[PDB]
Ligand binder design. Sequence first.
Ligand SMILES: Nc1nc2cc[nH]c2c(=O)[nH]1
Lengths: 381, 324
Amino acid sequence: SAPRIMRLVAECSRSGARAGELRLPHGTVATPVFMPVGTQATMKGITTEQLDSLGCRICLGNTYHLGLRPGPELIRKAQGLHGFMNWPHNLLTDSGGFQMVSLFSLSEVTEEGVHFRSPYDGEETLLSPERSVEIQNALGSDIIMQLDHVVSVTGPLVEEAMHRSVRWLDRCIAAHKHPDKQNLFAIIQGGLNADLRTTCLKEMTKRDVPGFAIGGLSGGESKAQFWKMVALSTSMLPKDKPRYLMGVGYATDLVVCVALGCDMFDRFGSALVPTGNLQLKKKQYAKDFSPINPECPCPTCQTHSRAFLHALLHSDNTTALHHLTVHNIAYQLQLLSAVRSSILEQRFPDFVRNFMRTMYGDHSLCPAWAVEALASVGIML
Amino acid sequence: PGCLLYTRTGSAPHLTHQTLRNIHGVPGIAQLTLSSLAEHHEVLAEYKKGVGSFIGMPESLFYCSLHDPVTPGPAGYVTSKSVSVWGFGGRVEMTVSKFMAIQEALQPDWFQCLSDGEASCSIKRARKSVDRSLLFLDSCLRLQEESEVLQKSVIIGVIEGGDVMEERLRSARETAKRPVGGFLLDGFQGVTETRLHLLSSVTAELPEDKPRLICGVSRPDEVLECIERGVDLFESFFPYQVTERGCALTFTFDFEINLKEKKYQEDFDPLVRGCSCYCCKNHTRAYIHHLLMTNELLAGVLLMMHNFEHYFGFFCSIREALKN
RNA sequence: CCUUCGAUAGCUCAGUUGGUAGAGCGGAGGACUGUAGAUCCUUAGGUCGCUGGUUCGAAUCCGGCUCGAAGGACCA
Ligand SMILES: Nc1nc2cc[nH]c2c(=O)[nH]1
């Protein structure tokens, strides 16, 4: 029996939103939380110290790219992932490889596992569920990924995909050696229809895995059907185990999914402010010396102006990219903190209105899918 | 002597405000290249409170240098009516009035007079250059006092006398008469034995009450010999060049190595073995090697910070040795 | 006065050998929603210093000036 890592202290009266905490050996996470993708944030210019200064406590990584270079053996010898990026907080590893291209750009999956191609013949590495769990134990992350047939994809292709996903989940469970120290998050994949997804919920609820997740949603369907699927999945799953969501990060999307009952959420040049997402490349306000956001705690707005960044946007490309990315991550963290605070002392059904009033100002301009989701969950604008 | 912090549009290249503040040994004077302050000129024409508040660092002193030390001089482009400053602004007929407007918008603490004398990069042309440079300095001195707010700024003199060292001596003698706040050497962009002798002859006459400035010299040997000649202030474009092509500095003051080789993937030590520099504490050289193979910007940031820290420490050490 | 070179996107330069302009570096619109299959797509920004001639067509061929770098000093 996998231990329950979530404790619940606040839940919305008029909605399904929840606030809780997750305990990990390296840190404590406050759900709902947003985990920025580690590779992007690292290459965009942000150092470890700058990202940590904003208060982020969870990071994301891809095991396939670490396996490509410098190799599983070298990363295991020096205990790579922990002391490599210098990230002191919790990190979530991803299997990778199964992007939206699927079989169009990746080799066909054999019986043992999935095989990747590389420009060099000798750079390829085997990715078996036993190999995946071994390399992830080598990484030593608090949350351990499980090898899955992630799809973008209709027909029975998804049917055998979920069959092999269940088989590989069983193989990973049989091959996992430290259930207490590291947690494994299962993935639910059923394509576009709900009945086979309902069955998927059935077997992955039969298995007592310490975590749950949903995938294959973003980039293939609209937001209305997406939130409907998320809501049904959250309703089916219990409250004693964490729920993970992919393809999220937008303010409206994240707020709606928080209201549904989610817990986890996954080249700069644009900024995010309460009024919305605005590109700093714009020359319409390149002259105004006011900060991007007077109330934003990020150093970029409180110390530097829009005009200076516009002059520096490509003048020192690395500096501008770092500033923009750190400002966006700080805004995301502030939005998550504000949402959690609205959850804590029960203002969400009102505050959410103000949230749209932050961007739109009225219910007329709100997205139709968001309005439908709010009406269904029990919040009327 | 002294050093000028190389600034790419306010902050150091590949350095943000917080990251630049994290750099130790930062001098109190920031060298802004006039070659990269044109759009800043139109912006600051009505900002009306200086560029220090514009960049967020108002407490530091500002020097408005014409030539970007990375690209400091051709065989010849500079005249005594405009200067083709290699950089990010100020190419299209930057006349004397254009310079006055740019320095009124920027309001630098010390603004550099336009250079001349592209011979150093024999007599008749040398004398013509001397007279023309003196006329330009006189015109700048006359125009500097026309604005009360601009009167807070300081002119920096220039010395250019063609090929023959006698004419360079006469240029230095006649320019030192003007009450300029500094002196500049042009045509010595790096240097050889002949240019070293010319620099020594030129500096043998200039009064010691004003600083000496040189452009295009940043290599440790060239910097050392120029200091031996008597040059005080220097530029710092060498670390930018070293970091740009994916190389790390290795010379010890108390060349460069390309990390794009497979031999560095096994060593767990940082780029510097057991010292007290920033690289000895930030990460290990294997991390930078991996990030260079994957072409990650964080490798560039770390290399830039380490190179700037090492270069500033080298300047601090040589200044301490010279003073003591 | 005389001789040799030099002036092009915010700016170094390729093109300068006649096809209306590109790259590095500036800078424009948009995408950051499990990045190594390379920081990506769209694309704003050039009376090519000025004047004049040549040509179907000129940054390019040709002369000189304004401003010139470089040589003999209009004068020393
Ligand atoms: N963690 C995680 N992220 C994504 C993003 C797309 N699919 C997935 C998945 O299956 N798991």
